[PDB]
Amino acid sequence: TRFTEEYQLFEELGKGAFSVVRRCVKVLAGQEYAAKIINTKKLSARDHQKLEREARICRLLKHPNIVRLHDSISEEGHHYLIFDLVTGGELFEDIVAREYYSEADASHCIQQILEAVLHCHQMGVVHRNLKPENLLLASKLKGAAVKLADFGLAIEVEGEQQAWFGFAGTPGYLSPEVLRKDPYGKPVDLWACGVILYILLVGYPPFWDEDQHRLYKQIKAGAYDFPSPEWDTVTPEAKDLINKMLTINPSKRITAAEALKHPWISHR
Amino acid sequence: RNKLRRQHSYDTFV
Numbered sequence: 682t683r684f685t686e687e688y689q690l691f692e693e694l695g696k697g698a699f700s701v702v703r704r705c706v707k708v709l710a711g712q713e714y715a716a717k718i719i720n721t722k723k724l725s726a727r728d729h730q731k732l733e734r735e736a737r738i739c740r741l742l743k744h745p746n747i748v749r750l751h752d753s754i755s756e757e758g759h760h761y762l763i764f765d766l767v768t769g770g771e772l773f774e775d776i777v778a779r780e781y782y783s784e785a786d787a788s789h790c791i792q793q794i795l796e797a798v799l800h801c802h803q804m805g806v807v808h809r810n811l812k813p814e815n816l817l818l819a820s821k822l823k824g825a826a827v828k829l830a831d832f833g834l835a836i837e838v839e840g841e842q843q844a845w846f847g848f849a850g851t852p853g854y855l856s857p858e859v860l861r862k863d864p865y866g867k868p869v870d871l872w873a874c875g876v877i878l879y880i881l882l883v884g885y886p887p888f889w890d891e892d893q894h895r896l897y898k899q900i901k902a903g904a905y906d907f908p909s910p911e912w913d914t915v916t917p918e919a920k921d922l923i924n925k926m927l928t929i930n931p932s933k934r935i936t937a938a939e940a941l942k943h944p945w946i947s948h949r
Numbered sequence: 950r951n952k953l954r955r956q957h958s959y960d961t962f963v
């Protein structure tokens with residue numbers, strides 16, 4: 682079947698629970714891709730549902746700031762999710778290297794992220810796991826576009842209907858409603874956007890603790906601040922957008938659509 | 950003091 686006869690495998694790009702991500706070449710086309718290779722030998726019925734869900738969600742999303750799924754190939758004992766190759770690496774690595782982004786660069790960055798999240802939300806997809814590791818740069822040329830990646834934890838929602846969809850995400854980026862084990866939906870992504878925007882502007886996260894129990898307490902109480910000296914030169918309107926994203930009550934939290942109309946984004 | 954660190958994803962509670 683198609684992958685084994687048409688594609689050649691090269692170096693590893695990442696790891697998963699029962700998957701690797703490897704660079705591959707479609708040999709006759711001379712085009713390179715990133716292949717998520719899932720070992721499907723004795724997968725549970727639910728694990729088969731989640732693989733199909735990831736494939737369906739990735740096929741659904743067509744956006745300049747979302748990684749394109751090229752193909753979904755089922756072979757004996759192996760499934761291949763074939764994505765466009767993205768060579769700029771994690772947004773995470775670029776923030777660490779540059780320490781922080783200027784407000785102009787941070788605004789441009791979060792604008793692209795919010796456009797990607799807006800599209801997801803319009804198509805009834807909640808990512809649930811937004812973070813700098815899951816945002817890739819299109820090239821190594823500075824000012825390259827950001828691409829939302831890894832919909833392995835993504836869920837399908839029916840309009841604005843919210844529910845307990847289970848405990849999933851990354852500690853530092855988890856919304857209060859997920860940590861309380863309360864019903865949630867699209868707003869969990871805007872909370873994560875708030876954490877990412879905070880990181881962009883000063884190069885460290887708003888919530889952090891060696892003790893995970895204290896981390897979760899600080900998140901649930903929205904106990905973040907803007908310490909000196911890094912926040913001393915940051916505009917009030919940057920702090921305002923962060924505040925509206927890092928709103929504990931998900932009803933009153935800014936939406937993707939609203940965030941894109943905020944003066945700090947739109948007047949620029 | 951808060952640090953930018955790579956963190957692992959969960960699909961159930963710790």
Ligand SMILES: CCCCCCCNC(=O)OC[C@@H]1O[C@H](OC)[C@H](O)[C@@H](O)[C@H]1O
Pocket residue numbers: 694695702714715717748764765766767768769770771817830831832833
């Ligand atoms: C994780 C399943 C989706 C794979 C999407 C591949 C997109 N193309 C793609 O070329 O991914 C590149 C690498 O892929 C991983 O991140 C997704 C590495 O952690 C990163 O170092 C990143 O550079």
